[PDB]
Design a protein around this ligand. Sequence first.
Ligand SMILES: CN(C)c1cc[n+](Cc2ccc(CCCCc3ccc(C[n+]4ccc(N5CCCC5)cc4)cc3)cc2)cc1
Length: 355
Amino acid sequence: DEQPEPRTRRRAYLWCKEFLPGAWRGLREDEFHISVIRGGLSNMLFQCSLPDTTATLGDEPRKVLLRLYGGAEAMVLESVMFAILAERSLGPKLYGIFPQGRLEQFIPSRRLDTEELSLPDISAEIAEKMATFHGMKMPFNKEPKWLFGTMEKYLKEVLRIKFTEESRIKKLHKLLSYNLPLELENLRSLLESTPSPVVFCHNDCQEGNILLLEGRENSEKQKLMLIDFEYSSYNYRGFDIGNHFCEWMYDYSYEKYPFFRANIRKYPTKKQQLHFISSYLPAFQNDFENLSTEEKSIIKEEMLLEVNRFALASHFLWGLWSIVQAKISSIEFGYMDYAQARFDAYFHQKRKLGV
Ligand SMILES: CN(C)c1cc[n+](Cc2ccc(CCCCc3ccc(C[n+]4ccc(N5CCCC5)cc4)cc3)cc2)cc1
């Protein structure tokens, strides 16, 4: 039970006392319980709780999550999004919002590991949860400018990076030797000919953003929750699914430099992809199962091509993102090696597709 700084404990006490009802309003500071869940310099997480000897007065929570962020448009959109998903029972409830952070429902859980993404019941539920997410109507721009707008933005940053450390200079020269402007436009041309509906996408469906709900671990359905919606946007459906498939290949729990492992052989097989989309489609279009077997087959075959082509944009986007992080991040991760891993997978997948 790691304790926060006294000033943070004091601030958290005050946010809980003023934003939460019932027993919280009369809580004494010396009976306030708080422990650090996740540290860092940004989006620190804390668990805040009543003492076990304090009875609740009504329906107020006994335990909450405090998220501390530490532009203004980004704050408005993210806060509105989180509030809406909470109303719709698709994210944790929202108890309080303030300039420094927010108070959220505490969901007893652990995150999934990379290997668990391939378990058939897990994969089927992720597909169902993603299809549900993709049905959200949200009050945000519905033009799918996000994917290539972000890749163009990152590419312009990357081309101008001036590293001073020798290994980063050398690794950057290799990544730029591919002629990334031209490759990005070849990717744009391919995806422009690849139909994919524009839906509200999570854009980051990795194992670290999927909760395994405590006490549901042996239940066949409804044991997961997708969280961490910060990067969500209207986007091509194929990206959300392809990006999720790419995440089967990357384990971020490796405790040595470069602090990830990559395994191209862990990408879902076409059998595993069919299992996923066979759960996705009836969750996204609930009379899907009443179609003929041949019409379902066509839809599934076309989706396989769609998602594996958009998986290329997952590699390209995250590869560029990682180079940018190598320049600007304050965190110990092997960003340049991860970039090379994503571009290696980009070209490997390009070959398999024949493009
Ligand atoms: C949609 N999109 C463009 C993004 C979506 C979300 N982010 C947040 C996002 C922000 C920051 C990071 C770096 C975190 C550094 C601290 C930290 C270090 C290691 C680990 C274990 N770990 C290591 C690497 C890791 N990665 C995710 C793929 C990139 C690699 C995850 C977990 C976890 C945390 C990663 C993702 C950024 C971009």
